[PDB]
Amino acid sequence: MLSDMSLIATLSFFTLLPFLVAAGTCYIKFSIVFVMVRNALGLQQVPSNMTLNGIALIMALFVMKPIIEAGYENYLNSGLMEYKQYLKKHTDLELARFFQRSEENDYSLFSLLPAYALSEIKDAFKIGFYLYLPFVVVDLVISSILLALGMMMMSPITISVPIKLVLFVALDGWGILSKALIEQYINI
């Protein structure tokens, strides 16, 4: 099947699989969003990073199922073209244009993958900032009330956590957020 060169190529690709997944898939967005939300709650290490990373990996596998299927059908037993099309769909035009060599359709995932990674980081940070707003609202309201009462030696960190948790539970939080992300990445 893989006599003496496809075997080497496959082993090399599978050895670079961790970094390829961590810098060329949807895992970056989910990981960044989850970490930013966990930090916005006011907590530091309450949910372990292993749990969030595993959830992000499972969601990335769900998103990447069609392209993974095509790649397994073609190479192991065309997938590169599908991956390039996916990157083109989910990249920013300006970054790819900059990564083009010089002299005024972008291709060469060698020069397209960094653009995809930067676009993913930018979008994830935007989502995190959007989700930060109600929590910062609660924090500022608590701070204003505490200052109004006359007490100033205690930070609002002590009282902000239960209210932020209540708001997130009432919003249902994780379920609707994951549904929104999956709907964004799955239209067809």
Binding site: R101, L113, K122, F125
Partner: protein, 86 residues
């Protein structure tokens, strides 16, 4: 065999990537969206190296003629320029 030439070229490319990463890491520090409190260390380094690879393969990196013999002066110049840029 040309496999030796391929290996030499790849290792030179990796050296240049190390240099560009040397220049880029302070920028990746003094920047409050890719701050090292929201991006895991297992994701930050590959992203930095991919950005470096894209920049060098786009032909937007300038190289002189390796004037200064001692590499320590070059290293400290790169570090201080990176701090200034950040």
């Amino acid at each position: 065999m040309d496999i030796s030439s391929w290996f030499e070229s790849i290792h030179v490319f990796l050296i240049l990537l190390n240099g560009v990463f040397f220049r880029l890491a302070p920028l990746f520090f003094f920047l409050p969206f890719l701050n090292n409190g929201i991006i895991s260390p297992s994701i930050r380094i590959p992203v930095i190296f991919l950005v470096a690879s894209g920049l060098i393969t786009s032909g937007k990196v300038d190289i002189g003629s390796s004037v200064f013999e001692h590499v320590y002066f070059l290293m400290f110049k790169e570090i201080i320029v990176g701090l200034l840029l950040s």
